[PDB]
């Protein structure tokens, strides 16, 4: 089972349902597509990468990389999604 997370610029990210349920905000928006008017694609793609990263490592754990150019926007999205 998969869900669709659409960024503000139209990009359609298709991730597993249980991966998206990590964020409580997304579960409320599903209860199956979610449109994010404030999150561009270069931020939402990192969020989905964090879903896989979180489910896999929850062996030695590597650092989750965040480029400095996307840190501020990813911070706002993570704060809103509470993930």
């Amino acid at each position: 089972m998969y869900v669709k997370l659409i960024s503000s610029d139209g990009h359609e990210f298709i991730v597993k349902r249980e991966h998206a349920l990590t964020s409580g905000t997304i579960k409320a928006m599903l209860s199956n597509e979610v449109n994010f008017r404030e999150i561009p694609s270069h931020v939402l793609s990192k969020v989905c990468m964090y879903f896989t990263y979180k489910v896999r490592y929850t062996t030695e754990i590597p650092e989750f990389p965040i480029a400095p150019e996307i840190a501020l926007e990813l911070l706002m999205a993570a704060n809103f999604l509470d993930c």
């Binding site: 979180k54 030695e60 965040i66 911070l75």
Partner: protein, 128 residues
């Protein structure tokens, strides 16, 4: 939260399986946090401790929390291995860490202003 004055020696290996400079912290017999010399990433150190003693570990530069043997490390009866690793930070806290390291103490909401200023701190975690 204090160490037990057991006087029973316990051999311990501080093993840093993290990309951070680990700062070991010993909680003395009055609960006060005591810092020890830091461990570069991927390096180990055999240290002399005692049974019932309390150890926690942080990032030496930012005091970010770290896990030892998946929070508190208590040397037991024999050496004991203390595996220090990166936890799975929340995406928000991980973002706060990166922003903290690029800006000195932004077009962001007022609630996130206080989050950036609420630095990780040993005394704050001890009350927790």
């Amino acid at each position: 939260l204090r160490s037990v004055n057991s006087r029973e020696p316990s051999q311990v290996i501080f093993c840093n399986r993290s990309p951070r400079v680990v700062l070991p912290v010993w909680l003395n017999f009055d609960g006060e946090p005591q810092p020890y010399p830091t461990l570069p990433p991927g390096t180990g150190r055999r240290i002399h401790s005692y049974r019932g003693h309390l150890w926690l570990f942080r990032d030496a530069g930012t005091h970010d929390g770290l896990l030892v043997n998946q929070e508190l490390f208590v040397p037991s009866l024999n050496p004991i291995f203390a595996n220090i690793t990166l936890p799975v930070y929340t995406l928000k806290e991980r973002c706060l860490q990166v922003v903290r390291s690029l800006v000195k103490p932004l077009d962001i909401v007022r609630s996130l202003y206080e989050d950036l200023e609420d630095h990780p701190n040993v005394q704050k975690d001890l009350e927790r």
